[PDB]
Each structure stands twice: as structure tokens, then as C-alpha cells.
Amino acid sequence: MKKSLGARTLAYPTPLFLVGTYDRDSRPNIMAAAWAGICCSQPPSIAVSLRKATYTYRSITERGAFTISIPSRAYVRHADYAGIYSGENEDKFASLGLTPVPGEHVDAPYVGEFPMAIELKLIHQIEHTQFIGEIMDVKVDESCLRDDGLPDINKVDPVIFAPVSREYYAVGEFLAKAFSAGK
Amino acid sequence: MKKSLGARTLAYPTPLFLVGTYDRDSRPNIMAAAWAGICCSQPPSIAVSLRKATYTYRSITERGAFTISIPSRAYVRHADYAGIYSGENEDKFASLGLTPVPGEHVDAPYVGEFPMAIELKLIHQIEHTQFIGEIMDVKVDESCLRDDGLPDINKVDPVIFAPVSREYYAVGEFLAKAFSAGK
Numbered sequence: 492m493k494k495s496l497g498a499r500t501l502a503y504p505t506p507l508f509l510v511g512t513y514d515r516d517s518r519p520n521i522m523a524a525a526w527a528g529i530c531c532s533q534p535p536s537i538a539v540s541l542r543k544a545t546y547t548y549r550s551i552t553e554r555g556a557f558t559i560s561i562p563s564r565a566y567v568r569h570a571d572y573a574g575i576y577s578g579e580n581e582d583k584f585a586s587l588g589l590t591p592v593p594g595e596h597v598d599a600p601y602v603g604e605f606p607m608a609i610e611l612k613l614i615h616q617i618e619h620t621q622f623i624g625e626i627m628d629v630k631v632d633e634s635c636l637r638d639d640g641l642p643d644i645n646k647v648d649p650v651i652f653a654p655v656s657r658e659y660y661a662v663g664e665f666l667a668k669a670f671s672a673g674k
Numbered sequence: 675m676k677k678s679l680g681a682r683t684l685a686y687p688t689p690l691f692l693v694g695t696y697d698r699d700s701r702p703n704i705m706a707a708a709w710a711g712i713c714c715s716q717p718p719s720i721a722v723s724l725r726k727a728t729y730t731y732r733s734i735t736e737r738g739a740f741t742i743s744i745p746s747r748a749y750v751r752h753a754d755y756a757g758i759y760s761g762e763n764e765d766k767f768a769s770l771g772l773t774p775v776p777g778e779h780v781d782a783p784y785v786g787e788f789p790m791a792i793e794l795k796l797i798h799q800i801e802h803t804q805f806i807g808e809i810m811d812v813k814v815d816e817s818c819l820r821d822d823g824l825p826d827i828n829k830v831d832p833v834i835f836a837p838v839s840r841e842y843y844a845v846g847e848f849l850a851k852a853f854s855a856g857k
């Protein structure tokens with residue numbers, strides 16, 4: 492039998508993206524975003540819903556660029572910190588002891604310690620409010636790649652956010668091949 | 675050291691939502707969507723990027739309503755099937771032996787066998803192409819709820835999609851509390 496929980500922001504999985512930017516004085520920042528996901532395959536793009544109150548919002552409107560860094564479980568507390576505190580008057584990289592690595596393709600830093608980072612160019616600002624970034628590059632630690640050059644998600648070891656209950660989870664075991672299992 | 679994988683639709687986690695609809699003749703359908711996620715907290719909303727070629731696209735434009743059903747690992751093959759084959763000339767519920775349960779709040783079916791189902795009213799069609807649904811209700815199997823009435827994600831046991839490598843994964847272990855661990 493099902494129970495109704497009502498109209499809640501409740502779905503699984505949700506991501507835990509750290510959205511990286513530079514402010515007008517080139518101060519690097521990261522914030523946590525779970526209201527996000529891939530939106531298009533042409534160009535490859537990610538949508539992120541960022542509130543106007545966030546310092547990151549301002550930086551993206553100014554520079555037209557941002558990164559997404561994907562934490563591994565070792566950095567779950569760091570990621571949470573970035574989702575509690577604002578960078579308006581704090582350098583979170585300094586506070587967290589993390590490295591703001593300049594993007595190679597876009598005007599934004601990513602988190603060097605994290606296993607995976609995505610460089611994005613702002614292509615749409617939709618206003619419901621969402622920034623749409625075109626994926627310019629996806630960078631992954633060599634230690635996390637399979638022989639065919641794609642990532643091993645269990646080596647990346649990304650964090651999952653459970654909304655409402657407000658918890659973080661790891662990725663578990665392989666289940667099946669997509670575009671295959673259903674045949 | 676990082677390696678560049680180039681401009682790919684590569685991020686983790688991504689969801690595996692089964693988007694449920696009725697066509698003009700009240701035939702129930704489900705398709706798989708991973709280019710999706712929560713977009714807003716007011717109203718609580720999910721964005722789904724559905725291609726014009728899908729039969730589901732047509733049904734959502736006609737009825738203004740859809741559901742999201744979240745498969746557990748037992749239904750990973752079923753979910754994959756729904757993402758390979760079209761419902762234009764096939765009843766996938768019949769093919770899969772699944773139950774199209776009418777929504778209580780919206781004009782769309784959900785998958786009765788799945789642990790969690792979300793009923794959505796179409797509120798925006800953005801055209802990059804995305805349907806924005808307002809969450810009207812979230813329904814969860816009683817067996818999957820904690821004593822406080824929220825779901826246990828490991829009991830729900832939702833599927834995660836790994837894009838490009840095209841694989842499905844389970845959710846693993848609890849890591850930490852959000853809005854807490856970072857303090």
C-alpha cells in the first residue's frame with residue numbers, strides 16, 4: 492500500500508554538485524546545488540537552479556561561466572559546508588583547505604581535490620529560475636578511469652543527496668547495462 | 675592528475691525516472707528519463723527534458739499531466755525496456771506485466787509496483803526543451819517509510835543512471851547528515 496506524503500521536493504537520486512565561480516575580484520567560490528541535472532545532449536548541457544540571494548548567482552551573471560565539481564565521500568563535510576555558508580565575505584577554499592584550480596576552457600575555478608570536474612559556459616538564463624551551462628570539458632582523475640577511458644563511478648565515489656530527510660549517501664553496486672538489460 | 679574526456683553528457687548521479695502518461699485514447703505509457711531533476715521549491719517542481727519524437731511528449735502536451743515512478747532494483751530491466759521501446763503502438767504495461775494506477779490528483783498513471791510515485795501537473799513548457807511539472811503528491815510504499823514518515827532511501831532502493839558508460843547502479847550506504855556535517 493502507498494502513503495501520500497503531500498507536495499514535497501522529494502525524489503531520488505538528487506546530485507550534490509559544487510558550483511564553482513570567480514567573483515568580480517577573482518575570489519574563488521563554491522556552493523552546493525542539488526536542484527540540477529543534465530538537460531540536453533546538443534550541446535551537452537547542465538541546468539542548475541540557483542537562487543538570487545546566493546553570491547554564486549551574481550558571479551555567474553557577471554562572468555558567464557561556472558564549474559561543477561563532484562565530491563567523493565571523503566569530501567562530504569566540505570560539500571555540506573559550501574551549502575551552509577556564503578562566499579560573499581568568506582573564501583571557502585581557504586576555510587576548507589581546498590584548491591581552486593582555474594578552468595582550462597572557462598572563466599571559473601574547480602575543486603582540485605575532487606575526482607571529477609566539469610567546465611561550463613553559460614548559454615541560457617531562464618526565468619522558475621535556472622542557469623543552463625554548456626559542458627565544455629569533463630575532467631576525471633586518471634585513477635578513476637576504466638581502460639576504455641570512461642569513469643568508474645565507484646572510484647569517483649560521488650555523493651547522493653536525499654532531500655527532505657536531508658542526508659547524504661554513497662553509490663552502491665552495479666546492477667545492469669543500460670540500453671541492454673531491457674532487451 | 676586529471677584527464678580531459680571532452681564535451682560529454684557526463685555527471686553523477688543521474689536519475690532513472692519513469693514518466694507516466696495517458697494518450698488520447700487513455701492508453702497508459704511510461705518512458706525512461708535521466709535528463710531531469712528537481713528545479714524549484716516553490717511550487718515544488720521537477721524538470722524533465724523530453725524529446726519531441728517521444729510518444730510521451732505528445733501525451734504531456736495534450737493532457738498537461740504526468741507522473742514519475744521511481745524503480746527499485748528489481749525493476750531495472752523493466753525501466754530499461756521503457757527507455758528502449760516506444761508506446762506509440764505498444765502498451766508497455768501489458769508487455770512488462772506492470773500496473774498502470776490512475777493518479778489521484780493528476781490525469782496520468784503511475785507504476786503500481788514501484789516503491790515511489792510522484793504526481794505532476796504541467797506548469798511550464800520551456801523551449802533546449804523541458805517540461806516543468808508541479809509536484810501535487812509524492813506516494814511511497816508504507817514498508818519504505820521511517821517512523822517520522824519520510825522515506826528510507828535504501829528501502830526505496832532507487833536506480834541511478836551512469837551516462838555514456840550506460841550503466842545502472844544502486845544507492846549505497848549512508849554517509850552523513852546534510853545541513854549538519856559541514857558545521
Ligand SMILES: Cc1cc2nc3c(=O)[nH]c(=O)nc-3n(C[C@H](O)[C@H](O)[C@H](O)COP(=O)(O)O)c2cc1C
Pocket residue numbers: 507520521522523524525526527540541542544545546547548570571573574575576577578579652852853
Ligand atoms: C544539499 C544541498 C543542496 C543545495 N541545493 C541548492 C540548489 O540547488 N540551489 C540553491 O540556490 N541553493 C542550494 N543550496 C544552498 C546553497 O548551497 C547555499 O545557499 C550556499 O551557502 C550558497 O553559497 P554562496 O552564497 O557562496 O553562493 C543547497 C545546499 C545544500 C547543503
Ligand SMILES: Cc1cc2nc3c(=O)[nH]c(=O)nc-3n(C[C@H](O)[C@H](O)[C@H](O)COP(=O)(O)O)c2cc1C
Pocket residue numbers: 669670690703704705706707708709710723724725727728729730731753754756757758759760761762835
Ligand atoms: C537510461 C535512459 C535515459 C533516458 N533519458 C531520456 C530523457 O531524459 N529524455 C528523453 O527524451 N529520452 C530519454 N530516454 C529515451 C526514451 O526513454 C525512449 O526514447 C523511449 O522509448 C520513449 O518512449 P515513448 O515513445 O513511449 O514516449 C532515455 C532512455 C534510457 C534507457
Ligand SMILES: [Zn+2]
Pocket residue numbers: 530531536537623802803
Ligand atoms: Zn538544455
Ligand SMILES: [Zn+2]
Pocket residue numbers: 530531532533723802803
Ligand atoms: Zn535537448
Ligand SMILES: [Zn+2]
Pocket residue numbers: 637638
Ligand atoms: Zn586496466
Ligand SMILES: [Zn+2]
Pocket residue numbers: 619620713714719720806
Ligand atoms: Zn522550476
Ligand SMILES: [Zn+2]
Pocket residue numbers: 540619620713714715716
Ligand atoms: Zn525556484
Ligand SMILES: [Zn+2]
Pocket residue numbers: 820821
Ligand atoms: Zn519503527
